[model samples]
Target: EKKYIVGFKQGFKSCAKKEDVISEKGGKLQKCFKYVDAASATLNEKAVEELKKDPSVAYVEEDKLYRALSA
Candidate 1:
């Protein structure tokens, strides 16, 4: 399993619809960043594959942290 950030498409009145979508695909919901129309969750390989194809999902991205440099 890996940390993931799932995003829903535009114009969604409530993120519950999106949450329900992710719930079906076997993910452990972490947080909802509904302002950006997205949510973070923990998902497995197959889960990632499933959401990527689902129409409701705009995109599924792995929650990889990037390195930062101090100026």
Candidate 2:
């Protein structure tokens, strides 16, 4: 199995301050991941677009295996 990292870098815009909502500001950064078959769930452009479009998601990324594990 391989490991991948995905998340968003934006925070929720605080509308309590009116200005914050108008300018889009104030929120917590969130992210998550799942261990699935590489061939089963391929991260394609369409998938990325979907994720980006998601309101909860701010950014997404993955980490590839470059070297074998050490004993």
Candidate 3:
């Protein structure tokens, strides 16, 4: 399994305030732990699950692949 980075993207008009994106506890940011195979469809589903759990998070989408970009 590979590690994945997950986060939320503000939906239009859903999270219109800065405070809307505040941390939950421990002074942490909005993120979660995901374990899945690299470059697989499961990654998307796992991310959406976290997003739906948080009302303040308007939408969830994969940020970027961790590997270095190629030309």
Candidate 4:
């Protein structure tokens, strides 16, 4: 499984609808902060591909792992 950040399009009156969409796509909801039109979750490649085809999804990006630069 891979982590992804999913952003929903504008004009959504509530987050419930967006949450439902993500869940339907096999995403395990990780975080849903208030006032943020996005969600963080873990999903497989197949699920990610399907999420890309959803119109309600504004964008889908893999959660990149990074470390601090050493001095």
Candidate 5:
């Protein structure tokens, strides 16, 4: 599994909607952000595939590490 950020569309129902949408795919939610209407979760490639096709999902982005640029 890998870390990812899930973003939902404006049709979101409850404050906990992020939880409902993610867990069903057997994903482990990491954290949530309300103002941004997004949440972080640890999901496998399979889960990632499903989310991409979900109508409620606006976007799914994989988490990446950023290191300091030693310019």
Candidate 6:
């Protein structure tokens, strides 16, 4: 399983609503952005594709981890 960020379409009731959608697809909600209508979650490869097909989901992006180097 890996982390993914999910974005919602405009004019949705609230980002919180997607909690059910993620859980239904066997995804665990990591964080929900308050300023933007998006959230971060972890799920299997298949589950990520399944979430992309959700009507409320605008886009599903893979979460890439990066490390900062000391200067």
Using lDDT as the measure, the top candidate is 1
TM-score of each: 0.82, 0.34, 0.26, 0.79, 0.82, 0.80
Q: Tell me, what's the RMSD of every candidate?
A: 2.0, 12.0, 10.2, 2.0, 2.1, 1.9
Which ten contiguous residues of candidate 3 have the minimum total lDDT? Answer: 33-42
Error of 6 at 50 (Å): 0.8
Worst 10 residues of 1 by lDDT: 10-19
User: What would the per-residue lDDT of candidate 2 be over residues 1-71, giving only the tens digit for each residue?
Assistant: 22223343345333222222212322222222233211112244555555556564445455555787897
How displaced is residue 60 in candidate 3, in Å? 1.4
lDDT of 5 by residue, 1-71 (tens): 38899999986645478888888877788888867878889998989989888888899998778899998
* lDDT, each prediction: 0.84, 0.36, 0.35, 0.81, 0.84, 0.82
**Candidate 2 lDDT for residue 37:** 14
> Candidate 6's residue-wise lDDT over 1-71, tens digit each?
38898888776546568777788878899988888888899989877888899887898988877898887
Q: Of models 2 and 5, which has the larger TM-score?
A: 5
Q: Which whole-number lDDT from 0 to 100 does residue 21 have in model 5?
A: 85
Local accuracy of candidate 1 as per-residue lDDT tens digits, 1-71 = 39999988876437577778888999888888847888889998988999999988899998888886876
Sort all candidates by lDDT, best to worst: 1, 5, 6, 4, 2, 3
State the TM-score for model 4. Answer: 0.79
* TM-score of model 2 vs. true structure: 0.34
Distance from true position, residue 20, model 4, in Å? 0.5
- Which residue pairs show collisions in model 1? none
